[PDB]
């Protein structure tokens, strides 16, 4: 079995000439030569069978990526695992090798307006397909956007994804949340479980702002600081936007704050294209109900060079009290189609 900078990475005879890329949530990431297709691929080693939450996230992601088929969504090319449940300790997910991610790119590269425009179009095109499947990504951020050498973009990491549930989205003030703090919509900290499509649009708005200046727009250092960062730019919510918040604790918190004025987008981003800032404003709308939807954003004048609804496909059909033993068995059965026996 092949070994990489420490431990076992046995991807069989098919995948050879391994190189360490980095580290994922449940294990090591490597590049490898696929001897069948004759191209270098990405391979993620996943070891989740000890913790049922890690099992839930692995299963949920495998299920979604196997049903999804879209140019702007990372596919699963192959899954490597032992022939029996007893011998299966790890799972290897084989995917297209990409050059970088938008996180790494933004740390050192200034994006031209043309690159921002194309990247945003591909994010929203992939997001249109996800939302058409009644799925919410819920963790969109630059490190979950993969890019190859020709700037083709693919959304990855569906570990926190859920089926949209708008009628059961309400919760109390300060409800604990899992997704990356800086890309969290303001309603998460007030009265939302993040079960509505509008939560993803907020994250895309944050990514767009980050592509414009190479810095996260709302870098909250803790749970409530996140909301303070958002309000420091959007300013105080209007009476109408406050009246939409029925939760008394959440509404009174906002009422307790001194008045804050809106920071104009053109002063925050003085070299940005005016149409980019108009779309940014609509994505970073405080009120989730007034926030632009994915199809409206694709139809915005900023994306006119790319918009083609007939070339922006949708999913063919819409898409945690289960023990780790049942989940391992479900992971085993979900990955069966890649076993050589067929
Ligand atoms: Cl530097 C870099 C970053 C990401 C990838 C990559 N390419 N393809 C994938 C990944 C990461 C894990 C998901 C699938 C390759 C090189």
Swiss-Prot record:
GO cellular component: azurophil granule lumen; caveola; centrosome; ciliary basal body; cilium; cytoplasm; cytoskeleton; cytosol
GO molecular function terms listed in the Swiss-Prot or TrEMBL record: ATP binding; DNA binding; identical protein binding; MAP kinase activity; phosphatase binding; phosphotyrosine residue binding; protein serine kinase activity; protein serine/threonine kinase activity
Regulation of its function: Phosphorylated by MAP2K1/MEK1 and MAP2K2/MEK2 on Thr-175 and Tyr-177 in response to external stimuli like insulin or NGF. Both phosphorylations are required for activity. This phosphorylation causes dramatic conformational changes, which enable full activation and interaction of MAPK1/ERK2 with its substrates. Phosphorylation on Ser-19 by SGK1 results in its activation by enhancing its interaction with MAP2K1/MEK1 and MAP2K2/MEK2. Dephosphorylated and inactivated by DUSP1, DUSP3, DUSP6 and DUSP9. Inactivated by pyrimidylpyrrole inhibitors.
Database matches in Gene3D superfamilies: Phosphorylase Kinase, domain 1 (3.30.200.20), Transferase(Phosphotransferase) domain 1 (1.10.510.10)
Residues bearing the modification Phosphotyrosine: 177
InterPro entries for the chain: Kinase-like_dom_sf (IPR011009), MAP_kinase (IPR050117), MAP_kinase_CS (IPR003527), MAPK_ERK1/2 (IPR008349), Prot_kinase_dom (IPR000719), Protein_kinase_ATP_BS (IPR017441), Ser/Thr_kinase_AS (IPR008271)
SMART domains, per the entry: S_TKc (SM00220)
Motif Cytoplasmic retention motif: positions: 308-312
Cellular location(s): Cytoplasm, Cytoskeleton, Spindle; Nucleus; Cytoplasm, Cytoskeleton, Microtubule organizing center, Centrosome; Cytoplasm
Modification comment: Phosphorylated upon KIT and FLT3 signaling. Dually phosphorylated on Thr-175 and Tyr-177, which activates the enzyme. Undergoes regulatory phosphorylation on additional residues such as Ser-236 and Ser-238 in the kinase insert domain (KID) These phosphorylations, which are probably mediated by more than one kinase, are important for binding of MAPK1/ERK2 to importin-7 (IPO7) and its nuclear translocation. In addition, autophosphorylation of Thr-180 was shown to affect the subcellular localization of MAPK1/ERK2 as well. Ligand-activated ALK induces tyrosine phosphorylation.
Active site per database record: 139
Assembly: Binds both upstream activators and downstream substrates in multimolecular complexes. This interaction inhibits its tyrosine-kinase activity. Interacts with ADAM15, ARHGEF2, ARRB2, DAPK1 (via death domain), HSF4, IER3, IPO7, NISCH, SGK1, and isoform 1 of NEK2. Interacts (via phosphorylated form) with TPR (via C-terminal region and phosphorylated form); the interaction requires dimerization of MAPK1/ERK2 and increases following EGF stimulation. Interacts with MAP2K1. Interacts with DUSP6. (Microbial infection) Interacts with HIV-1 Nef through its SH3 domain.
Family: Belongs to the protein kinase superfamily. CMGC Ser/Thr protein kinase family. MAP kinase subfamily.
Record's comment describing the protein's domains: The TXY motif contains the threonine and tyrosine residues whose phosphorylation activates the MAP kinases.
Disease named in the record: Noonan syndrome 13: A form of Noonan syndrome, a disease characterized by short stature, facial dysmorphic features such as hypertelorism, a downward eyeslant and low-set posteriorly rotated ears, and a high incidence of congenital heart defects and hypertrophic cardiomyopathy. Other features can include a short neck with webbing or redundancy of skin, deafness, motor delay, variable intellectual deficits, multiple skeletal defects, cryptorchidism, and bleeding diathesis.
The protein's name: Mitogen-activated protein kinase 1
Organism for this UniProt entry: Homo sapiens
Lineage: Eukaryota, Metazoa, Chordata, Craniata, Vertebrata
